[PDB]
Structures are given as C-alpha cells and as structure tokens.
Ligand binder design. Structure first.
Ligand SMILES: O=C(NO)c1ccc(CN(Cc2cccnc2)S(=O)(=O)c2ccsc2)cc1
Ligand SMILES: [K+]
Ligand SMILES: [Zn+2]
Length: 357
C-alpha cells in the first residue's frame, strides 16, 4: 500500500505584484511540504512527478475563450495583468500564473493516473493556485482552472467515461465552479460543506444552499451542506459525515474519491472563522479511505494560516499512509443550527438516497 505525493516548488512563482502579503501566498505549498519533511512523512511517500496540463486537457472543463485569455497572461505587461485580474471576482495575476495553474492540474492528473493504474493506493497533491471557484468560462476566487473538476474528467478519459467520481469539498467556501461543471452530471457526485450564512459568505450565491440537488440527470448528485450562524468545528463536521457524507457516498459507490481539501475551515484561519482541528481533518480523511477501495486523492484548495494548513494537511497524509486516527478534543454538543442544516439536507436528499430514509 503506497501513498503518492506530488509537489513542485515552481507553483510558488504565481504571486500578487501589488500585495506581497496577500493570503494566497507562494509559501502555502512550501510550508506544507516542509512540515511533511519535518514529521518524516515525505520519505514514506512515493514522489509522483509533476507536469504541465495541456490545453486539450483544460478543454475537458473550460471554454476555448477562457483558456486563451488566461494563456495570454503569460506575456502580458503589468497594466494588462492588473486590468485583467480586476475583471474577475478576487483574482490577481502574474506572468507565472498560467503556467502555475497548468502545473497544479497536471500534477493532479499524474496523481490520478498513478492511483487508477494501481501504482499507488492513494495520494496527496500540494498545489496552488486553487481550483474550485473556477467556472467553465471564468476565473474567480484565486482560481484559474478547476483542478479537481479537470482531474475527475481526466480520470474518466483514461478509464471509462462513466467512471463514478466522488468529489468531497471541505474547503470552508462553496466550490461554485465544481457544482456548476457537474450540475447536470450523475457520473460525478459533488458534496460540499461550507460556511453559507444565508448566502452572505463568499462566493455570496444562493447556489450553495441545500435545496440545490442537481439538474437533469444530475438530480440527487449535488449535495450542499451549508452552515449558518455558528463557529463550526469538529463536532459539526463529524456529524455531517456520519449522517450525510458517508451514507450517500457508500450508496453512490465511487470508483475514485477526490478531496477538494481546502484548510480554511481550520482553527486559526484568518478568513474562515471555523475551528476544525488537524485531528478532525485526519478523521475525515480516514472515513473517506473506506470508499473506492481506498482510491483517494487529496487536492489542496484554500487555507491561509500557514501553520494550520501545514499541520492539517500533513495529518491527512499520515492517515493515507495507514497511521491510526489521533484522538479528538472534547466534542461540544452539536451547535443547534448545525442540527438544522443536517436535517434540511436530509430532507432534500432522502428522495434520491435510500440510505438516508
Ligand atoms: O479560499 C477561498 N476559496 O476557497 C477564497 C478566499 C478569499 C477570497 C476573497 N476574499 C473574500 C472573502 C470574504 C470572506 C470570506 N471569504 C472570502 S478576501 O481575501 O478575504 C478579500 C479581503 C479584502 S478584499 C477581498 C476568495 C476565495
Ligand atoms: K453532480
Ligand atoms: Zn476557501
């Protein structure tokens, strides 16, 4: 049982020319990698080679216009980069951004390929810029191309088109791009937990509410677990996994699990306002490992406290390597509003998943 790891320092080259202290820092990935070395986890993993995605691979999920506009930024002058970035919601661009986004995606393709060909059982991808806010036709929220969505489609392209992929998105934000890309698809089950606040939390759309269950053949294959009015943490996430994520995932019976693993719900994050602990993330990882015969790929999304993300992701890797789940801190009673959220999702998805009845 081998665990793969992909990391390339050159993904640090994407940077904010106006604000060197912008939270989506180059050192997010080097810090996570360093913590893996410090804990002696890196040598326990097989290093998967990084590579650039191709334009044809980007077209699995993105329009030709979007690909061409982002590709063009590699040769843009600063004024062009600033103006282009300001056309999107929450994007900064440098001359290295396009190449870094390609590297994040291609690293994830190689990791999925290593899993699907039986070279490794599971894997972790320490990548930036993130992906889950990127839409077919636009960039958004620090994301240029939807790495996780592209990896699901890439996996299908090297296996069979109907390969069942589960994407679990535990970044504190709703993965609007991932939801939209797969909204009419039953081959990719999208499950997101996210701070919602009745639509007031970024990305500020009611598309993230529990009543969005999918469209067309995808009805039932989009599961939004939105949190309102409360500093959620381990008790709420464990309860959501027990009552919703795991029962639905088991019924779906995925052949590959991708984790959109943002660590911005972590205790200490400057943006998320939540308190999921590193041991909490470890328990979530260990639960997902019971699916798809253990074929799990953990993909870095957001997460902005360098210490928190480094501890949290490195513990997920420890779980993938087979280590025993660490003890959790005392779990307070579920916040009353988290009970309401879980029951609302249960009511919305009981029609589609017999395991919830
Ligand atoms: O991690 C992410 N996605 O997965 C992610 C994180 C941050 C943003 C942009 N921001 C808005 C925001 C507000 C409240 C909660 N979250 C996000 S912002 O940086 O704070 C900002 C501060 C002064 S202007 C803009 C976009 C995406
Ligand atoms: K779907
Ligand atoms: Zn996020």
């Amino acid at each position: 049982p081998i665990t793969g790891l992909v990391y390339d320092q050159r993904m640090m080259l994407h940077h904010n020319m106006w604000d060197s202290h912008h939270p989506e820092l180059p050192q997010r990935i080097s810090r996570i990698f360093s913590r893996h070395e410090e804990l002696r986890l890196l040598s326990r993993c097989h290093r998967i080679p990084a590579r650039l995605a191709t334009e044809e691979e980007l077209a699995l999920c993105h329009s030709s216009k979007h690909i061409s506009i982002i590709k063009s930024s590699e040769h843009m002058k600063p004024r062009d980069l600033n103006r282009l970035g300001d056309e999107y919601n929450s994007i900064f661009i440098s001359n290295e951004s396009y190449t870094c986004a390609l590297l994040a995606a291609g690293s994830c393709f190689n990791s999925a390929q290593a899993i699907l060909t039986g070279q490794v059982r599971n894997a972790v991808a320490i990548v930036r810029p993130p992906g889950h806010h990127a839409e077919k036709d636009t960039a958004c929220g620090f994301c240029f191309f939807n790495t996780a969505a592209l990896t699901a489609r890439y996996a299908q392209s090297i296996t069979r088109e109907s390969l069942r992929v589960l994407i679990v998105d535990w970044d504190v934000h709703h993965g609007n791009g991932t939801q939209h890309i797969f909204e009419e698809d039953d081959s990719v089950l999208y499950i997101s937990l996210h701070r919602y606040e009745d639509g007031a939390f970024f990305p500020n759309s009611e598309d993230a509410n529990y009543d969005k269950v999918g469209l067309g053949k995808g009805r039932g294959y989009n599961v939004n677990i939105p949190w309102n009015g409360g500093k959620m943490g381990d008790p709420e996430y464990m309860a959501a996994f027990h009552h919703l994520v795991m029962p639905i995932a088991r019924e779906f019976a995925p052949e590959l699990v991708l984790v959109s693993a943002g660590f911005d719900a972590a205790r200490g994050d400057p943006l998320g306002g939540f308190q999921v602990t590193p041991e909490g993330y470890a328990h979530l990882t260990h639960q997902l490992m019971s699916l798809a015969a253990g074929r799990v790929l953990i993909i870095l999304e957001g997460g902005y406290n360098l210490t928190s993300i480094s501890e949290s992701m490195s513990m997920c890797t420890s779980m993938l390597l087979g280590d025993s789940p660490p003890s959790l801190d005392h779990l307070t009673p579920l916040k009353t509003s988290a009970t309401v959220s879980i029951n609302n999702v249960l009511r919305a998805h009981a029609p589609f998943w017999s395991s919830l009845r």
